Design a protein around this ligand. Structure first.
Ligand code: NAG
Lengths: 49, 391, 97, 49
């Protein structure tokens, strides 16, 4: 069988470092413009996007 | 089989309450437990909690959901309850109206509203009636374009009518600095009829580029699906006059009417099982213990829940979970920036008030008389609805 | 069960920006990414998928707020074309579910 | 058929002769219940395998 797999894709313990790397570097530009909102507070209290 | 009519927002619950209690046929145990919880179910916690205490309190085996707000994905979370549990849930109006593309294999969901494929066929029926055989398609990366174009392409391919399809555009505003990437291709459009598939927010933007190029005004007629229209009251004042769109009927098919037929569908389908089962399915009266509550699966109900006819009109749902024969209405944007109703589409029949297009001076009438080889009239072709070729 | 509630009183009650999915203990299952992309999907709260190998979370018509750190199974077709591009294969027959 | 004999020998392939069913040479015609034009005769028996 000429199968197929992936490498460095199952390293979930090491995946979060790249996973947090992109988002943490993305909030830098997120909080760099006008009218930057706030994430919804609670569940029942918030009612819309 | 208890039916819980759930409606949220700013609507009339008493109209739903009075209509639901008036059961037309008592031959089946409708037993509609109409809680009619008016609490805003926008938050997931509210809706998920009330569902499994509704099943706990009244031992119901059916729910119908109604909503007033947009709630673009309140059906997405609603489908999760249907998939995890086995109790059928049928949408009525609002955030459950839009058709979900794909659901779970065991999804107990049936929405009210035509799918994208149905919306693609009705626009062609408009085009067939008015003989605008030449057309072009503009689309985006939004999902369903691979199906919207395919439905158009399949209908066009190998047809008696001499359709003319060209200039399929598959670019939108998602790409950065796309202002120069969409003007070059938009200059390649030459057909008087352009079929558009986009999002309401980018629909205004995509026309702004078209207005700059000049593909607007008279001589060009564009057609858009229901989701592009978004809301009849919300006119973004950017869409040109003559934007003809097709959407589900929000006026005639009223909320008390929707529950009347909607509550009938689940009752007659479930009672059909009791004829051949003699044992009403009883999922656990909770939103937990799904591992042990799913043993008594009632997927046989789903297999025939779709095929249901009530009061003559067949309200059957497709296997994917969209209405087979919906009551679509054709809406047109007049010169006053207000959506204007035109005609009604049902039973594969397109009947509309305007027998001729109100376009007007590039539109000049001509009076002729049927005499001699000078002018010859024989008949119209009813096989496809189009007049003829070379006539 | 708790997944429907596993975001309101303990995740979005603590001022969350992004949600990271888990990995199901059984590899041949996908219960893990369904609720996070539904409760937070319609809340416009982005959800990052680190062990979501299924291709359903690839349209964004449903699961609108979903990011994936691993390409799905359907992306194996992208390399297959390049794989037979180097072996000059042209007569193939697909066998899919 | 004579031309077929010389064509097969110089090409190394075996042939089985089977005639059409309807007997028409081939054209595109409309079908009842919507247009959906299809080929009939040889042409339908060639595109359909
Ligand atoms: C035709 O094929 C046969 C066996 O398949 C053999 O004689 C040879 O390969 C060919 N003969 C020719 C091309 O003259």
């Amino acid at each position: 069988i000429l199968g197929l797999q992936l490498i460095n894709g199952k390293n979930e313990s090491a995946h979060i470092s790249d996973a947090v790397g992109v988002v943490a570097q993305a909030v830098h530009e997120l909080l760099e413009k006008e009218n930057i909102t706030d994430p919804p507070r609670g569940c029942v209290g918030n009612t819309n996007i | 089989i208890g039916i819980a009519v759930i409606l949220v927002g700013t609507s009339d619950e008493v109209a739903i309450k009075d209509a639901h209690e008036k059961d037309d046929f008592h031959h089946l145990s409708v037993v509609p437990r109409v809680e009619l919880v008016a609490m805003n179910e926008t938050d997931p916690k509210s809706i998920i909690t009330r569902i499994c205490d509704l099943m706990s309190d009244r031992k119901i085996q059916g729910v119908v959901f109604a909503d007033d707000t947009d709630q673009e994905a309140i059906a997405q979370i609603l489908d999760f309850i249907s998939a995890q549990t086995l109790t059928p849930i049928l949408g009525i109006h609002g955030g459950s109206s839009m058709i979900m593309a794909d659901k779970d294999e065991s999804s107990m969901f049936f929405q009210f509203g035509p799918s994208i494929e149905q919306q693609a066929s009705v626009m062609l029926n408009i085009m067939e009636e008015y003989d605008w055989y030449i057309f072009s398609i503009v689309t985006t990366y939004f999902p369903g374009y691979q199906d919207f174009v395919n439905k158009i392409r399949s209908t066009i391919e190998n047809s008696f009518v001499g359709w003319e399809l060209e200039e399929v555009l598959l670019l939108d505003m998602s790409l950065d600095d796309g202002d120069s990437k969409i003007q070059n291709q938009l200059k390649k459009l030459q057909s008087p009829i352009i079929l558009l598939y986009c999002t309401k927010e980018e629909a205004t933007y995509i026309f702004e580029v078209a207005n700059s190029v000049g593909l607007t005004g008279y001589g060009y007629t564009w057609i858009v699906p229901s989701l592009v229209a978004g809301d009849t009251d919300t006119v973004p004042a950017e869409f040109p006059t003559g934007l003809i769109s097709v959407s589900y009927d929000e006026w005639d098919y009223g909320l008390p009417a929707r529950v009347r037929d909607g509550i009938a569908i689940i009752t007659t389908a479930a009672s059909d099982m009791l004829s051949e089962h003699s044992f009403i399915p009883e999922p656990k009266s909770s939103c937990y213990n799904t591992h042990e509550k799913r043993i008594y699966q009632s997927n046989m109900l789903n297999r025939y829940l779709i095929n249901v006819t009530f009061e003559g009109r067949n309200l059957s749902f497709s296997e994917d979970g969209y209405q087979m024969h919906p009551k679509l209405v054709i809406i047109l944007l007049n010169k006053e920036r207000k959506w204007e109703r035109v005609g009604k589409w049902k039973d594969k029949s397109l009947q509309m008030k305007y027998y001729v297009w109100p376009r007007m001076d590039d539109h000049l009438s001509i009076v002729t008389l049927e005499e001699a080889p000078f002018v010859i009239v024989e008949s119209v072709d009813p096989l496809s609805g189009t007049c003829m070729r070379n006539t | 069960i708790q997944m429907a509630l596993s975001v309101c009183e303990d995740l979005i009650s603590s001022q969350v920006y992004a949600i990271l999915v888990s990995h199901p203990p059984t590899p041949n299952d996908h219960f893990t990414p369904t609720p996070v992309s539904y409760t937070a999907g319609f809340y416009r709260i982005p959800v990052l998928g680190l062990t979501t190998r299924m291709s359903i979370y690839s349209d964004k018509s449903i699961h609108l707020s979903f990011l994936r750190t691993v390409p799905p199974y359907s992306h194996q077709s992208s390399v297959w074309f390049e794989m037979m591009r180097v072996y000059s294969w042209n007569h193939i027959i697909l066998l899919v579910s | 058929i004579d031309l077929l004999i010389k064509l097969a020998r110089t090409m190394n392939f075996t042939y089985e002769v089977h005639l059409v069913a309807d007997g028409k040479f081939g054209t595109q015609e409309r079908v009842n219940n919507s247009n959906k034009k299809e080929w009939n005769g040889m042409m339908g028996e060639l595109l359909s395998g």
